[PDB]
Enzyme design. Structure first.
Site, PDB file in Angstrom:
ATOM      1  N   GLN A  84     -37.659 -63.975 -16.547  1.00  0.00           N
ATOM      2  CA  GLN A  84     -37.213 -63.802 -17.915  1.00  0.00           C
ATOM      3  C   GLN A  84     -36.476 -65.009 -18.430  1.00  0.00           C
ATOM      4  OE1 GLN A  84     -36.012 -59.373 -18.690  1.00  0.00           O
ATOM      5  NE2 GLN A  84     -34.828 -60.072 -16.928  1.00  0.00           N
ATOM      6  N   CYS A 112     -32.654 -54.195  -7.959  1.00  0.00           N
ATOM      7  CA  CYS A 112     -32.838 -53.605  -9.269  1.00  0.00           C
ATOM      8  C   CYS A 112     -31.467 -53.096  -9.680  1.00  0.00           C
ATOM      9  CB  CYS A 112     -33.802 -52.435  -9.185  1.00  0.00           C
ATOM     10  SG  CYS A 112     -34.028 -51.572 -10.775  1.00  0.00           S
ATOM     11  N   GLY A 113     -30.823 -53.777 -10.627  1.00  0.00           N
ATOM     12  CA  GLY A 113     -29.413 -53.460 -10.901  1.00  0.00           C
ATOM     13  C   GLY A 113     -29.265 -52.066 -11.504  1.00  0.00           C
ATOM     14  N   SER A 114     -30.108 -51.732 -12.494  1.00  0.00           N
ATOM     15  CA  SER A 114     -30.037 -50.403 -13.092  1.00  0.00           C
ATOM     16  C   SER A 114     -30.378 -49.297 -12.089  1.00  0.00           C
ATOM     17  CB  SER A 114     -30.952 -50.283 -14.342  1.00  0.00           C
ATOM     18  OG  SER A 114     -32.301 -50.463 -13.966  1.00  0.00           O
ATOM     19  N   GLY A 115     -31.292 -49.594 -11.161  1.00  0.00           N
ATOM     20  CA  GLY A 115     -31.557 -48.671 -10.054  1.00  0.00           C
ATOM     21  C   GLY A 115     -30.329 -48.453  -9.176  1.00  0.00           C
ATOM     22  N   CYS A 146     -30.067 -52.564 -21.413  1.00  0.00           N
ATOM     23  CA  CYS A 146     -28.614 -52.725 -21.267  1.00  0.00           C
ATOM     24  C   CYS A 146     -28.290 -53.424 -19.951  1.00  0.00           C
ATOM     25  CB  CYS A 146     -27.885 -51.359 -21.297  1.00  0.00           C
ATOM     26  SG  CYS A 146     -26.080 -51.549 -21.103  1.00  0.00           S
ATOM     27  N   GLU A 150     -39.948 -50.468  -8.413  1.00  0.00           N
ATOM     28  CA  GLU A 150     -39.691 -50.608  -9.844  1.00  0.00           C
ATOM     29  C   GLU A 150     -40.870 -50.215 -10.711  1.00  0.00           C
ATOM     30  OE1 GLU A 150     -37.467 -54.284 -10.777  1.00  0.00           O
ATOM     31  OE2 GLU A 150     -36.754 -54.157  -8.684  1.00  0.00           O
ATOM     32  N   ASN A 202     -38.642 -45.966 -12.231  1.00  0.00           N
ATOM     33  CA  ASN A 202     -38.115 -46.668 -11.064  1.00  0.00           C
ATOM     34  C   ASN A 202     -37.744 -45.660  -9.981  1.00  0.00           C
ATOM     35  OD1 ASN A 202     -37.829 -49.503 -12.334  1.00  0.00           O
ATOM     36  ND2 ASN A 202     -36.804 -48.165 -13.830  1.00  0.00           N
ATOM     37  N   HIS A 227     -35.148 -43.390 -13.870  1.00  0.00           N
ATOM     38  CA  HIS A 227     -34.961 -43.470 -12.423  1.00  0.00           C
ATOM     39  C   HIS A 227     -35.143 -42.159 -11.733  1.00  0.00           C
ATOM     40  CE1 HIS A 227     -33.335 -47.550 -12.804  1.00  0.00           C
ATOM     41  NE2 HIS A 227     -32.939 -47.082 -13.991  1.00  0.00           N
ATOM     42  N   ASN A 255     -33.435 -61.778  -9.087  1.00  0.00           N
ATOM     43  CA  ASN A 255     -34.001 -61.654 -10.477  1.00  0.00           C
ATOM     44  C   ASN A 255     -33.818 -62.912 -11.276  1.00  0.00           C
ATOM     45  OD1 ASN A 255     -34.753 -58.755 -10.664  1.00  0.00           O
ATOM     46  ND2 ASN A 255     -32.667 -58.593  -9.832  1.00  0.00           N
TER      47      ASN A 255
END
Lengths: 275, 274
Positions: free
Chosen positions: A44, A217-220, A73, A208, A190, A159, A11
């Site tokens: 980003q 995908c960190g939040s995943g 977050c 995603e 996701n 998710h 990422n």
């Protein structure tokens, strides 16, 4: 303008110190800089700023490749924490920062990984958002022919976590799109394909929201562990292997924040003549 | 290792000074550095080297993102020339270089453009390669039911040039593939779709050999203008508008080299820790 190129498991960010130089952007300039051929190239943009509250060490904000501000977050947090240390803006190991999502403390570990407090996983279907009768540990969904069993959770973002025998044979490319903008996810989701190797180790692939499959995908990773914990499959510390590498998630369950620890790689430094 | 990021009409390069720095590569390292997420991100790597010859200023070589060396005429030449000037490695207006395609002299203009001698266009069918009976100004080709009038020329690489009413309505996505690997091109061809705005001005789209449509193919701009000149359509100096921007081609015809003048943008400098 000085910048650094960094990534958290593929990422990628352009990271810019706005403490020691003047950093000026327009939405159009961000779009130009993000262009892989015409600009620096990045998913980003991460801008690191002095703190606006004397109780904090820094503030940071993030823009996407379209030039608009992102508020998720933990987004960019690991690259942020290593950047401020690598640039000599601080030598603290516990770093207090404000973001578009409030304040937190980031910790750089003995192995130079970063620990992020990702907040408490929210399983309430209306918080996802997810159309369901009520919160359940397991839901039934249809993907044309197939019956899918999944858990659903919010990490600030939506998710859908499906357990699989082997991430390598999971039908990510055919099931992902179907579930990603399923009618039952008004804001899309996701889609995680989780293989439970043992209680302390999963493999994961993630399709995603609006991007399809990426390397990590960190939040995943957070979501898949939170769901596996709630389904009684996982222990409270879990190694997650994604295509792009490793994360470690720690969660003591409802009533607790979930923690994500992972690497951030410093690829290069540079200068772009913006005048 | 220091480097610069540059592009010639969207064709992007990592460029490295291996004259004043000790710079080392492996195929694997190039692959990693080309990677847009894990590395610097580029289509090709251009390494600037000493000449080992007092009749030359520099040598350069180019690697693709797979890590192998590329030998295409004019490839990277304009980024190379502005790089050596911007970095103070030379101050010459006319720079003598050797490459994988031989030697040439590059000229940096007063407006910071670079003029490349692309050699004399070769219209001989066997040199393309192109199957035909003999060299002709205009050939008839078949692309399924469609009759195509075209000119065909080698610029070091193979081109087929079709005149269209409007490049935006040209059937690039359907004719391009059919013509690109036409049986009459044993090594495939770059297919240009050329709209003549004025004798001094064309618009151009190019369906590239092995790649499909690109934003800018410099050799295709030279070939279209070569063909248009030979077909009696174009002046000896022609503005070429590609999707990625402007080139200017100049050619006095058979017995003369064709010159391509174009921009090279210095995007950023950088350092990567090796």
């Amino acid at each position: 303008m000085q910048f650094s190129k960094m990534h958290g498991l593929g990422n990628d960010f352009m990271v810019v110190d706005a403490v020691t130089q003047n950093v000026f952007f327009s939405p159009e300039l961000i779009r130009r800089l993000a262009d892989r051929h015409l600009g620096v190239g990045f998913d980003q943009l991460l801008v690191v700023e002095p703190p606006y509250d004397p109780e904090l060490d820094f503030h940071y904000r993030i823009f996407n490749a379209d030039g608009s501000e992102v508020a998720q977050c933990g987004n960019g947090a690991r690259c942020f924490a290593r950047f401020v240390r690598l640039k000599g803006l601080t030598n603290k190991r516990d770093i207090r920062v404000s973001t578009a999502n409030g304040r937190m403390v980031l910790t750089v570990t003995d192995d130079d990984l970063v620990r992020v407090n990702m907040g408490e996983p929210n399983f309430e279907p209306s918080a996802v958002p997810f159309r369901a009768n009520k919160a359940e540990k397991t839901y039934i969904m249809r993907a044309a022919e197939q019956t899918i069993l999944c858990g659903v959770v919010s990490m600030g973002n939506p998710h859908c976590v499906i357990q699989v025998d082997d991430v390598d044979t999971a039908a990510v490319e055919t099931l992902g799109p179907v579930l990603e903008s399923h009618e039952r996810f008004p804001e899309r989701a996701n889609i995680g394909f989780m293989q439970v190797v043992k209680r302390e180790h999963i493999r994961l692939r993630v399709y995603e929201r609006g991007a399809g499959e990426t390397q990590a995908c960190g939040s995943g990773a957070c979501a898949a562990v939170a769901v596996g914990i709630q389904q009684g499959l996982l222990a409270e510390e879990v190694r997650v292997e994604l295509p792009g590498g490793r994360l470690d998630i720690a969660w003591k369950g409802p009533g607790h924040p979930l923690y994500m620890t992972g690497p951030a790689v410093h690829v290069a430094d540079g200068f772009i003549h913006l005048h």
